[PDB]
């Protein structure tokens, strides 16, 4: 199961 | 102890060319899935046989995620440019390593999450899955941004729950396969003399996994001084190779023993010339 949504750098 | 990781990369292209994104999954250090934007049909593909057991719901779900992450890197890669005062279009690379370790008790041992811009560390999530470690003054803007948005907490969730959950599952799917071991087929070679010295090379070929230990000894006492060893290298057929060499004082050839220790071996090999 791969990574998902997240706040930008 | 077991683990799962995802090494992802997004490399910027000189021109207006959208950045190439690639993701590789790893269970117990074995690559198991892979996504690549360069492919004609960009999709997460099975990279281990025990992975073909997954239905389309899985492969579509994963591919969706990879395409979201594809755009996640396009932006962040755009933001880092500003942060670093970098120009319009050059070669820029951003990678991230995430995953989770499972102790002997199958409970979460550690969770990981870290980025690197241009091959140098950028920002990592500490082992408490709450605080961040920014590498430089540039990574300070991101960290403060990530402290504001509470990003850390949302990675803590994936790490403690979904990463752990899914590692337990692939571990079950790839039982014997991941645990398989191929034993090294060793042998020693002889090489021409330099007035008063000959080289003895011990070869270990056809082993899996990569971890191997080769040693050259003299009359029992291990000689580590002036021993030549190659970094383990893949044969290209899934097995690895390596070799240990010692420039031995001729005549005294048979005085040197070589042992090979590998997890696949029932007993460590010992060889001589």
């Amino acid at each position: 199961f791969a990574p998902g949504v997240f706040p930008y750098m | 102890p077991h683990s799962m990781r995802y090494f992802e990369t997004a490399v910027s292209r000189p021109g207006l060319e959208e950045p190439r994104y690639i993701s590789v999954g790893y269970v117990d250090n074995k690559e198991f899935v892979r996504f690549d934007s360069d492919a004609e049909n960009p999709r997460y593909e099975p990279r281990a046989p025990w992975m073909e057991q997954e239905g389309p719901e899985y492969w579509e779900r994963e591919t969706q995620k990879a395409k979201g992450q594809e755009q996640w890197f396009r932006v962040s890669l755009r933001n880092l440019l500003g942060y670093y005062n970098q120009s319009a279009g050059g070669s820029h690379t951003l990678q991230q390593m995430s995953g989770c370790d499972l102790g002997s008790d199958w409970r979460l041992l550690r969770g990981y999450l870290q980025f690197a811009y241009e091959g140098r560390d950028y920002i990592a999530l500490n082992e408490d899955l709450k605080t961040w470690t920014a590498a430089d003054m540039a990574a300070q803007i991101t960290r403060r941004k990530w402290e504001q948005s509470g990003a850390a907490e949302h990675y803590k969730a994936y790490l403690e729950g979904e990463c752990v959950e899914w590692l337990h599952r692939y571990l079950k799917n790839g039982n014997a396969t991941l645990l398989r071991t191929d034993s090294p087929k060793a042998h020693v070679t002889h090489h021409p003399r330099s007035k008063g010295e000959v080289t003895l090379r011990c070869w270990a070929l056809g082993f899996y996994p990569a971890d191997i230990t080769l040693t050259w000894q003299l009359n029992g006492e291990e000689l580590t001084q002036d021993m030549e060893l190659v970094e383990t290298r893949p044969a290209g057929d899934g097995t690895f190779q390596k070799w240990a060499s010692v420039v031995v004082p001729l005549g005294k050839e048979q005085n040197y023993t070589c042992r090979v220790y590998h997890e696949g071996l029932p007993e460590p090999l010992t060889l001589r010339w």
Partner: protein
């Protein structure tokens, strides 16, 4: 600016025997950026079909790749690997050694 210099190992998949087809490998490792160009040569001629593995990186963010090809070792012919990367001013070409 962020360049790291590739480490090359040219070696065959099986121990060489003149006349017996085999596969010559070029394990380029430790480089950054991920853009590189690896050439397998024979007698100074670029070998036409050189198959490269997919791009992967390790814990220290550096990349590695395995370039391989079909070759038939003889005593006369020489083989080698020429790597071109931005961390280097000029290509690095290392030769296959039967004994290593």
């Amino acid at each position: 600016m962020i360049q790291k210099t590739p480490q090359i190992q040219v070696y065959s998949r099986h121990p060489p025997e003149n006349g017996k087809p085999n596969i010559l490998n070029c394990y380029v490792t430790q480089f950054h950026p991920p853009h590189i160009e690896i050439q397998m040569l024979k007698n100074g001629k670029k070998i036409p079909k050189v198959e490269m593995s997919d791009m992967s990186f390790s814990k220290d963010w550096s990349f590695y790749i395995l370039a391989h090809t079909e070759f038939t070792p003889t005593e006369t012919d020489t083989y080698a690997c020429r790597v071109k990367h931005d961390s280097m001013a000029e290509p690095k070409t290392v030769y296959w050694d039967r004994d290593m």
